[PDB]
């Protein structure tokens, strides 16, 4: 039941022209800070963000004068909250979690964690959004062709 009872927000893909437009996303139930413009990156390794990006020597910190980095992450194999923490530790300005199946948007919830891993939940700051498989696939196709994917996030509705 209540399969469509999701806190939806609009995002805008501003480039490339082929996929530019407004899309629905679901803001995660954690770490909500406003509008932010950034550029999307899909890493070649560690694509589910379940291990530290430091182990791969991967950083998403943007150089001065460039757009902040929104990292595109695949759903699966670990909690959404851990993905957001790990992307945050790697310097990403936001995380977009692409659903692994084509379905209505879902709300990324916070798990009940062991005492040894409870404190990071309080320390998540970066905006986190779940996007559809269809949009994730569209962004990946654009990036693999060499296009720059820019995006405006809006969490004012949250």
């Amino acid at each position: 039941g209540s399969r469509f009872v999701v806190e939806k927000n609009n995002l805008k893909v501003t480039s490339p022209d082929s996929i530019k437009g407004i899309y629905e996303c679901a803001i995660g139930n954690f770490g909500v800070p406003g509008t932010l413009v950034g550029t999307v990156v899909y890493p070649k390794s560690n694509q589910k963000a379940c291990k530290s990006y430091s182990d791969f020597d991967i950083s998403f910190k943007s150089k001065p004068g460039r757009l902040p980095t929104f990292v595109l992450i695949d759903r699966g194999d670990c909690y959404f909250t851990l993905k957001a923490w790990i992307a945050q530790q790697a310097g990403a300005a936001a995380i977009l979690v692409a659903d692994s199946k084509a379905e209505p948007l879902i709300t990324m919830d916070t798990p009940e964690e062991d005492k040894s891993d409870a404190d990071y939940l309080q320390n998540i700051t970066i905006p986190s959004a779940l996007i559809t498989k269809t949009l994730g696939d569209s962004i990946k196709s654009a990036l693999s062709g060499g296009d720059m994917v820019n995006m405006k996030l809006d969490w004012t509705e949250s």
Binding site: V6, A26, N29, C78, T107, M108
Partner: peptide, 5 residues
């Protein structure tokens, strides 16, 4: 529609 993973 809430999921942890």
């Amino acid at each position: 529609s809430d999921r942890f993973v």
